[PDB]
Ligand binder design. Structure first.
Ligand SMILES: CCCCCCCCCCCCCCCCCC(=O)OC[C@H](COP(=O)([O-])OCC(O)COP(=O)([O-])OC[C@@H](COC(=O)CCCCCCCCCCCCCCCCC)OC(=O)CCCCCCCCCCCCCCCCC)OC(=O)CCCCCCCCCCCCCCCCC
Ligand SMILES: CCCCCCCCCCCCCCCCCC(=O)OC[C@H](COP(=O)([O-])OCC[N+](C)(C)C)OC(=O)CCCCCCCCCCCCCCCCC
Ligand SMILES: CCCCCCCCCCCCCCCCCC(=O)OC[C@H](COP(=O)(O)OCCN)OC(=O)CCCCCCCCCCCCCCCCC
Ligand SMILES: CCCCCCCCCCCCCCCCCC(=O)OC[C@H](COP(=O)(O)OCCN)OC(=O)CCCCCCCCCCCCCCCCC
Ligand SMILES: CCCCCCCCCCCCCCCCCC(=O)OC[C@H](COP(=O)(O)OCCN)OC(=O)CCCCCCCCCCCCCCCCC
Ligand SMILES: CCCCCCCCCCCCCCCCCC(=O)OC[C@H](COP(=O)(O)OCCN)OC(=O)CCCCCCCCCCCCCCCCC
Ligand SMILES: CCCCCCCCCCCCCCCCCC(=O)OC[C@H](COP(=O)(O)OCCN)OC(=O)CCCCCCCCCCCCCCCCC
Ligand SMILES: CCCCCCCCCCCCCCCCCC(=O)OC[C@H](COP(=O)(O)OCCN)OC(=O)CCCCCCCCCCCCCCCCC
Ligand SMILES: CCCCCCCCCCCCCCCCCC(=O)OC[C@H](COP(=O)(O)OCCN)OC(=O)CCCCCCCCCCCCCCCCC
Ligand SMILES: CCCCCCCCCCCCCCCCCC(=O)OC[C@H](COP(=O)(O)OCCN)OC(=O)CCCCCCCCCCCCCCCCC
Ligand SMILES: CCCCCCCCCCCCCCCCCC(=O)OC[C@H](COP(=O)(O)OCCN)OC(=O)CCCCCCCCCCCCCCCCC
Lengths: 63, 347, 459, 52, 55, 120, 98, 57, 140
């Protein structure tokens, strides 16, 4: 292969690897925030479903 | 046993575990454990000898004590939260009790003494159920309550399990005792990563089950339960010695085999959380397990131990044991590392 | 690299599907053809490395190591087929399979772009190497040798795994090209001290570093001849190749973290060279000779100069051919007298004239006669180490005197004097043995004509 | 649940008994019905990290 | 003095010796239900009094 | 971490949104490796039962390859779906929290000071 | 908490200590196991009854049923041990030591 | 027999040579996936020659 | 343990050595009692006085190791005026190792205990300086 093909093949390799590296650093930062704040789709630990509640008038009034 | 009754009992062992895994209610989780314990005792007793009776009794006492502690934790949780949902516990005392109860059920150190003895005292097929299927229900519970688990407690149980499992296996010549200590050591890896990434707990569990299932199946194929009886395999079924070698190296966590994958992925998750000392200690201590796996490979595959004259009679008959799924399991036990990214299906 | 990986993989079905009596002919012929095609890796550029894909690349450092690796496979098949002649067919084929799998792991190891891909293949080479030592070694001690080999390597390489993953979390990549541009200086803290040790100890154990070398005299001595050839010629150089790569991300801490390991190497080379003078086992002497030579490579890598890096690359290649030749020469006597004791068979020049010429040529390259590439590598390292500190010339000078002494002591004891009277089975050298020796020494002396192709990326 | 078979199949195996503010026989309310209702509705959907 | 002795003693021989000793302590058990469950009681008491795992 | 995803259709192997992703190619190198594992399992099955390894029971060997490739195809579809979901979640979060992921004003090497450590 | 819980929790603790500190009879340890269940039944019933958790009123029954079934299994094992050795002493159950 | 038996004796000798051809071919296919900067680097970018359509393949 | 450790790390290095020693003696003494409890439970003593003798022998050894390490390391930090130095612990850790050899009456164990306890103690001090986490809290 000539130097030009290897040179520009290297640039294509570097671009992919640089893009993956930035995404890897971004994922770690995103995970740290989500786990700290709980405001994301990850680390979403379930709470009790409120459709289970019965809203009918009960046997007694105060409830 | 009547074969139909044996099938019904196995299906009940599975039903108990499935109930634990689909239940949203703590009472149904407890019932699943009770059903599971009831159904497994007969398969331990099935060969009727004093050793099988002692193992069944030791197992019953350990599991019943664990299940009472589990119920105590559930009731304390009810008193402090007024609800039964399988989720994070709402009292630190309840968390400690349930964590200890599940550690007792898993045979984690220092609640481990029953695993070597119970495994030794029962047939190989029963030991296969005990060391693989029986881990599923306790792990599935730990998977759901981990946010409320005390970090120091669970990591302490993990470190001790890796240490005790590694040291315990060094002094063993019985195959069933070796697999019991290997199970204890592998247990510590699963729980060590649980606080950080429960998905890697599942990955290690699945791969551990596959490799352990492969080992028991090959031990059953030749009816070998001791190191020296396994050392005759080269002069009966040479291919089995090669398969045993590959699986033992895989269980040792050597690249490029499948057993390296869980160790590799657990180390990654712990380092992402700035846990450097603990994964390094765990990785080094796991060399103990590699040592007594390698000792087995020396007596089975890499050298030729003395045979007996009557072994010549065995040459004239074929293997007639079923060895179900063995070709598939041994391939998965060894050749899966190139497919490691597939672990995302567990997410 | 697929043009080398796939043909290497095909050696396995070739071995298994061949006629029973053609397993050695077929595998030897086609492994030589693969070795011939490896010369296409010599398309190196002055500025940029030859970067094939996301997974693999080759620069002037890995290219000579790859050519050596692929050259060694046919030589090992030739060296093994005599002492495996009574092995049953299936076990012969499995022996060849282990050699092929080792070559596959090695050529991928030397071209891996990502340090964690390098790690997996770097550990992968353990498995076939352990099997070769323990299954086909001859003595009881092979079992113990395998354990020392395995656990010395893993004790070091498991901390390396933690370090590498830590680096990927912090930098975002372990791709070696990326690390050349994103590398940051290492601050001097206790935590970085142990990162440095984690990144280096695994490679130090494989060199081996003096103090951590006890596995080598066991493994190199108990292995079968093919095992010794690859262990000394190539596998020791994984440590050197790994150090040459990973030091990129360890500056400037290497300035002071090098001192304890430079002292171990500079003093260790004199210690191990002295040991050679009193060894009674010929194979053991050759094994201790390797430790002394690799001490120079460790020192050269740690002082991090353009001259020391060229010298280190040349020495690794030069030592690979020489140490493999010496093991093959020693093995040819062993196949006759069935002992490794050096004083047992004397005066062999009288009985085996041409073989005594190979001994002389092997000895002269071992003591680095100019203009051999053994001398070129050693000289470049001595030059750079003199600049690091003039006083080092004393330790380098003493080592060269001792090296000449044990190299010619081995020659004189075995080849000269009077033959042993009762040893009467020294049959003439086989064509196979003579071809095996000349396929070591001929390439070694030819490289003297064009040394630049083994001087590495700093050339 | 580890495997949420109940939600997939839409069958209520044991959810009916998990909380005290769910439907009861003859609409008998638990003593803390109002408090449990208010806590469940507050924490619903936001996850346990936020809810704590 | 160095190669065959001290370089063996300071690392492989001593590390190997310690693991063997630890292994016999772990595996020298009497197989008694009474003692194993007595150790459980110690574990639970330690976990609360010393390490406060219940909090 | 992704257990409670807002759009997690629970206990579904491949939720419907996965159908928007390109399927694995039948020539996928990972699928080819899965088929190879199936072929190895077929050879091992012959070996342990002492049949001629390469020729015995070609029907059985074919079902080993097919079943591995068949199961492998769906596992790869889920694998690719789970990484697509991870990226989708990551980018949505970054958009919703710009204050946490600011674009850096990044300088040339002519402006930034790096210490020189001579190697001598 | 209310005063009664102190004693019910003490009873569970006492029976748990009794369970973990064996003497000789395997039977005496099974009784401690049943004692643990009795204290759980009482504490569960008190919590459920006092809170008027109506649907949970069935839970103590399920607890009792499953624990009695597990006690039947324990008694069966004890009888098989007594058949082998002629006593229910736990010191005879030490074969698996080796 | 000629041709046959000869082929049965010596057909294994195509394996490694066909491995090299296949390995060579796959190496070219990987190069077609790394064309993002073909004729776009600052060092070598140029106008295409009249007939020519890509500077390298 | 949480409290005794907190007390030890509150005292600045190379000062109030008497209070430093009291903390390390308690940590060592507690470890000895824990070891005694498992030993007595798993290897039944022949008699009640035999078991009390074993407990005293194990507890005294651990407390003696804990006292010397705390005393030796605090004094080294004082005469060198180097509070934040791992060498102080390295010295304290070896002194505790030599005590272990003396109690076991073995030179070999003493030398091995010196080397490994000394390095372990030094690593502990490095970790405190650099904030190394053994049981790291989950973050990501
Ligand atoms: C419902 C859906 C279908 C599921 C079926 C559930 C099982 C019921 C059918 C099995 C009974 C039967 O058919 O024959 C009775 C029949 C009774 O007649 P008998 O001969 O007079 O009695 C002899 C003894 O009773 C027994 O004879 P033996 O003592 O000489 O040895 C028997 C041995 C002989 O079996 C073998 O040939 C060796 C291979 C068995 C191990 C391979 C299982 C798979 C390993 C994991 C991979 C997943 C697949 O089989 C066993 O060990 C029984 C346990 C098998 C399950 C092992 C647990 C694996 C862990 C599963 C983890 C899954 C999650 C992973 C993540 O005996 C048998 O044939 C037993 C072998 C049955 C076929 C192989 C095992 C079942 C297939 C694997 C199912 C995997 C699902 C998990 C099962 C969990 C159970 C607790
Ligand atoms: C007869 C069926 C027996 C199954 C129960 C016995 C085996 C249980 C243990 C399995 C191995 C250990 C755990 C494996 C976890 C993998 C789960 C997964 O990722 O896929 C679940 C996926 C994804 O579900 P999910 O995304 O909601 O969460 C899965 C549960 N976690 C995350 C905790 C692991 O669901 C499905 O596969 C669809 C359900 C298909 C049901 C078909 C059942 C078989 C009958 C045909
Ligand atoms: C690897 C070693 C592990 C052993 C391999 C296990 C093989 C599992 C087989 C999975 C392939 C199933 C193909 C079936 C596809 C199909 O046609 O039917 C669909 C059906 C579920 O349909 P569903 O998506 O839920 O409903 C549609 C409404 N949206 O399909 C189903 O019922 C789903 C079947 C359940 C699969 C469970 C999850 C499989 C993952 C197992 C663990 C994988 C371990 C990976 C390890 C990583 C390292 C390599
Ligand atoms: C980071 C830098 C790394 C570089 C420095 C590396 C230093 C060298 C490390 C050497 C490791 C130990 C030595 C390994 C050589 C092989 C050991 C050996 O062969 O000893 C033999 C000894 C005799 O017993 P045995 O062989 O079983 O009897 C015949 C029945 N087979 O066998 C035995 O008695 C049992 C031997 C058990 C030890 C197995 C090896 C495990 C090594 C890891 C130690 C784990 C430590 C974990 C402890 C944590 C708690 C403190
Ligand atoms: C036999 C077993 C074989 C295995 C061998 C294992 C070797 C492991 C070696 C690990 C040692 C790593 C060093 C850890 C100490 C901390 C290093 C540090 O951060 O100190 C910094 C300081 C640098 O000093 P300075 O150069 O003045 O600073 C720049 C200004 N010019 O520090 C300095 O002053 C730099 C000097 C550090 C090196 C000290 C050398 C001690 C003397 C040589 C010993 C040779 C090795 C002895 C091995 C025996 C083992 C039994
Ligand atoms: C990575 C690659 C791993 C592939 C694993 C392949 C599947 C496992 C081995 C299958 C071969 C086997 O198990 O038996 C050896 C077989 C002996 O042949 P034979 O018994 O005479 O049967 C008649 C042949 N028609 O041998 C044969 O003659 C059949 C040809 C296939 C031989 C495969 C050799 C396997 C060695 C793999 C070692 C690991 C490689 C690294
Ligand atoms: C129609 C009937 C129904 C069944 C049809 C199913 C067919 C497919 C199942 C797989 C079988 C593949 C074909 C196997 C051919 C075996 C023929 C054979 O055994 O003869 C031996 C032959 C010649 O050997 P010979 O010269 O006689 O003696 C040499 C002495 N050493 O030696 C040979 O030449 C054998 C060559 C090796 C066999 C081919 C290897 C195939 C590799 C498959 C890779 C799988 C990849 C999957 C990827 C899929 C992804 C989509
Ligand atoms: C000379 C030193 C001067 C004194 C200072 C040191 C003492 C500090 C105070 C520690 C508490 C006392 C420790 C004594 C424990 C009991 C010793 C013992 O072995 O008891 C005898 C008994 C033997 O059983 P057996 O063979 O059946 O003979 C029966 C004879 N009556 O043994 C058994 O049955 C074993 C079961 C009972 C023991 C349970 C384990 C708890 C005791 C562990 C040791 C103490 C550590 C725990 C307590 C710390 C708080 C004080
Ligand atoms: C001291 C410096 C340490 C600095 C921090 C780093 C911690 C290092 C941890 C070292 C762990 C050492 C483990 C040694 C195991 C003992 C092995 C042995 O051989 O001891 C035997 C001895 C019993 O005597 P023996 O004859 O063997 O058996 C009698 C049978 N009836 O056994 C016994 O008598 C009982 C053994 C108890 C050993 C416990 C020692 C721990 C001491 C902790 C002191 C540190 C204080 C806290 C410091 C906090 C700030 C750092
Ligand atoms: C790296 C750390 C470098 C440490 C430097 C060495 C320190 C001195 C070690 C002691 C050397 C020694 O003298 O050992 C032998 C002696 C017993 O003498 P003896 O048995 O009578 O001799 C017979 C020989 N034929 O001594 C003995 O009694 C044996 C003492 C055994 C205790 C060894 C302590 C090591 C175990 C704990 C740490 C394990 C760490 C594992 C690291 C993982 C490795 C991968
Ligand atoms: C039986 C032996 C018992 C004697 C050991 C007693 C425990 C010694 C204390 C270290 C472990 C527990 C601990 O308290 O660690 C925390 C302590 C730092 O204390 P802190 O006030 O939190 O300051 C943090 C500033 N970064 O210091 C640390 O952060 C610990 C640093 C980790 C050291 C790891 C040592 C590696 C070698 C292990 C073998």
């Amino acid at each position: 292969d000539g130097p030009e093909k290897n040179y520009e093949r290297t640039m294509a390799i570097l671009q992919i690897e640089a893009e993956k590296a930035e995404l890897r650093l971004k994922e770690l930062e995103v995970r740290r925030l989500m786990r700290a704040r709980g405001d994301g789709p990850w680390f979403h630990y379930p709470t009790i479903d409120k459709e289970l509640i019965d809203h009918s008038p009960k046997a007694t009034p105060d409830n | 046993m009547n074969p139909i009754i044996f099938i019904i009992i196995l299906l009940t062992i599975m039903l108990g575990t499935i109930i634990v895994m689909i239940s949203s209610h703590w009472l149904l989780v407890w019932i699943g454990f009770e059903m599971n314990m009831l159904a497994i005792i007969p398969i331990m007793m099935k060969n009727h000898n004093p050793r099988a009776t002692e193992a069944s009794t030791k197992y019953f006492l350990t599991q019943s004590t664990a299940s009472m502690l589990l119920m105590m934790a559930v009731i304390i949780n009810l008193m402090f939260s007024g609800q039964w949902t399988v989720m994070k516990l709402f009292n630190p005392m309840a968390s400690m009790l349930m964590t200890m109860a599940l550690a007792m059920k898993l045979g984690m150190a220092p609640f481990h003494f029953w695993v070597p003895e119970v495994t030794q005292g029962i047939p190989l097929s029963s030991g296969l159920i005990l060391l693989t299927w029986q881990k599923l229900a306790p792990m599935s519970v730990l998977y759901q309550i981990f946010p409320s688990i005390n970090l120091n407690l669970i990591l302490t149980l993990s470190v001790l399990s890796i240490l005790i499992g590694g040291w315990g296996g060094l002094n063993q010549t019985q195959l069933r005792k070796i697999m019991a200590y290997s199970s204890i050591a592998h247990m510590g890896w699963m729980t060590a990563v649980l606080p950080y990434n429960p998905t890697m707990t599942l990955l290690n569990l699945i791969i551990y089950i596959i490799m352990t299932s492969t080992m028991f199946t090959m031990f059953m194929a030749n009816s070998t339960t001791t190191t020296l009886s396994l050392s005759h395999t080269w002069n009966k079924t040479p291919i089995m010695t090669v398969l045993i070698l590959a699986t033992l190296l895989s269980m040792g966590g050597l690249p490029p085999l499948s057993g390296f994958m869980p160790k590799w992925m657990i180390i990654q998750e712990m380092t992402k959380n700035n846990s450097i000392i603990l994964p390094t200690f765990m990785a080094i201590t796991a060399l103990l397990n590699l040592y007594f796996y390698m000792r087995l490979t020396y007596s089975t595959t890499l050298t030729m131990f003395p045979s007996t004259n009557n072994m010549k009679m065995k040459w004239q008959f074929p293997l007639m044991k079923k060895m179900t799924f063995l070709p598939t399991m041994v391939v998965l036990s060894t050749m899966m590392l190139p497919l490691t990214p597939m672990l995302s299906v567990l997410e | 690299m697929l043009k080398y990986i796939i043909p290497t993989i095909m050696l396995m079905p070739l071995t298994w599907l061949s006629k029973n009596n053609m397993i050695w002919v077929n595998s030897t012929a086609h492994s030589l053809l693969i070795s011939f095609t490896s010369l296409l890796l010599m398309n190196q550029f002055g500025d940029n490395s030859l970067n094939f894909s996301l997974l693999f690349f080759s620069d002037s450092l890995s290219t000579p190591l790859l050519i050596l690796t692929m050259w060694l496979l046919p030589l090992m098949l030739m060296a093994s087929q005599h002492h495996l002649s009574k092995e049953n067919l299936t076990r012969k084929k499995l022996f060849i399979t282990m050699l092929i799998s080792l070559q596959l792991f090695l050529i991928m190891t030397f071209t891996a772009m990502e340090l964690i891909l390098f790690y997996i293949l770097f550990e992968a080479t353990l498995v076939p190497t352990l099997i070769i030592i323990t299954r086909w070694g001859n003595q009881t001690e092979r079992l113990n040798a395998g354990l020392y080999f395995l656990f010395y390597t893993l004790a070091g390489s498991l901390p390396l795994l933690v370090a590498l993953i830590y680096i990927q979390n912090t930098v975002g990549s372990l791709n070696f090209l990326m690390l050349q541009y994103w590398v940051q200086p290492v601050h001097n803290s206790w935590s970085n001290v142990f990162m440095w040790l984690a990144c280096m100890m695994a490679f130090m154990v494989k060199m081996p570093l003096y103090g951590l070398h006890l596995w080598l005299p066991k493994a190199h001595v108990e292995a079968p001849i093919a095992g010794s050839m690859v262990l000394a010629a190539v596998l020791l150089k994984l440590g050197g190749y790994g150090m040459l790569r990973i030091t990129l991300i360890l500056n400037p801490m290497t300035d002071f973290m090098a001192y304890p390991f430079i002292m171990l190497s500079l003093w260790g080379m004199i210690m191990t060279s002295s040991i050679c003078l009193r060894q009674t086992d010929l194979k053991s002497l050759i094994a201790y000779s390797s430790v002394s030579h690799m001490a120079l490579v460790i020192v050269a890598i740690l002082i991090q100069t353009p001259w020391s890096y060229m010298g280190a690359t040349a020495l690794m290649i030069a030592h690979g051919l020489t140490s493999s030749m010496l093991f093959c020469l020693a093995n040819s006597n062993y196949e006759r007298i069935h002992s490794r004791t050096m004083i047992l068979a004397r005066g062999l020049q009288t009985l085996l004239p041409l073989m005594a010429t190979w001994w002389l040529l092997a000895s002269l390259t071992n003591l680095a006669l100019p203009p051999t590439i053994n001398l070129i590598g050693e000289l470049f390292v001595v030059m750079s180490t003199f600049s690091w500190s003039n006083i080092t010339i004393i330790l380098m000078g003493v080592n060269m005197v001792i090296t000449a002494l044990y190299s010619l002591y081995m020659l004189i004891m075995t080849q000269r004097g009077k033959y042993t009277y009762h040893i009467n089975n020294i049959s003439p050298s086989f064509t196979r043995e003579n071809a095996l020796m000349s396929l070591h020494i001929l390439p070694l002396l030819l490289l003297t004509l064009n040394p630049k192709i083994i001087l590495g990326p700093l050339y | 649940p580890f495997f949420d078979v109940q939600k997939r199949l839409g069958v209520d195996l044991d959810r009916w008994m998990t909380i005290q503010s769910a439907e009861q026989p003859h609409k008998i309310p638990s003593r803390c019905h109002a408090f449990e209702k208010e806590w469940i509705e507050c924490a619903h959907g936001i996850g346990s990290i936020r809810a704590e | 003095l160095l190669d065959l002795i001290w370089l063996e003693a300071i690392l492989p021989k001593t590390i190997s010796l310690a693991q063997m000793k630890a292994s016999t302590l772990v595996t020298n058990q009497k197989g008694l239900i009474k003692l194993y469950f007595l150790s459980f009681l110690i574990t639970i008491l330690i976990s609360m009094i010393l390490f406060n795992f219940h909090e | 971490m992704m257990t409670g995803r807002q759009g997690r259709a629970t206990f579904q192997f491949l939720p419907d949104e996965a159908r928007s992703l390109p399927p694995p190619k039948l020539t996928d190198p990972r699928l080819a490796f899965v088929g190879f594992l199936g072929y190895c399992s077929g050879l091992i099955d012959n070996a342990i039962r002492r049949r001629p390894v390469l020729l015995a029971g070609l029907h059985r060997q074919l079902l080993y390859i097919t079943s591995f490739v068949f199961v492998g195809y769906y596992l790869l579809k889920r694998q690719d779906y789970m990484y697509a979901v991870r990226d989708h979640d990551m980018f949505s979060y970054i958009k919703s929290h710009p204050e946490d992921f600011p674009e850096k004003d990044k300088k040339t090497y002519g402006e930034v000071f790096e210490e020189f450590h001579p190697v001598r | 908490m209310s005063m009664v819980y102190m004693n019910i929790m003490m009873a569970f603790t006492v029976s748990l200590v009794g369970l973990l500190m064996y003497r000789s009879h395997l039977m005496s340890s099974l009784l401690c196991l049943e004692g643990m269940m009795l204290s759980l039944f009482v504490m569960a019933a008190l919590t459920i009854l006092n809170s008027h958790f109506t649907l949970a009123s069935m839970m103590p029954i399920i607890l009792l049923v499953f624990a009695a079934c597990e006690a039947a299994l324990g008694l069966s094992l004890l009888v098989m041990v007594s058949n082998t050795y002629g006593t229910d002493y736990v010191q005879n159950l030490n074969l698996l030591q080796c | 027999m000629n041709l046959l038996q000869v082929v049965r004796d010596h057909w294994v000798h195509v394996l490694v040579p066909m491995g090299f051809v296949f390995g060579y071919y796959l190496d070219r296919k990987n190069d077609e996936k790394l064309t993002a900067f073909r004729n776009k680097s600052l060092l070598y970018k140029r106008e295409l020659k009249p007939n020519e359509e890509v500077t390298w393949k | 343990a949480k409290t005794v450790l907190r007390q030890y790390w509150d005292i600045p290095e190379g000062t109030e050595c008497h209070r430093k020693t009291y903390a390390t003696t308690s940590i060592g003494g507690a470890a000895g009692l824990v070891v005694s409890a498992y030993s007595v439970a798993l290897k039944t003593p022949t008699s009640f006085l035999e078991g009390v003798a074993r407990t005293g022998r194990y507890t005294f050894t651990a407390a003696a190791i804990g006292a010397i390490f705390g005393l030796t390391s605090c004094i080294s930090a004082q005469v060198r005026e180097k509070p934040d130095d791992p060498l102080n612990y390295l010295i304290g850790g070896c002194a505790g190792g030599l005590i272990l050899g003396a109690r076991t009456r073995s030179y070999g164990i003493g030398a091995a205990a010196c080397a490994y306890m000394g390095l372990t103690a030094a690593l502990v001090k490095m970790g405190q300086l650099e904030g190394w986490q053994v049981f790291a809290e989950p973050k990501v």
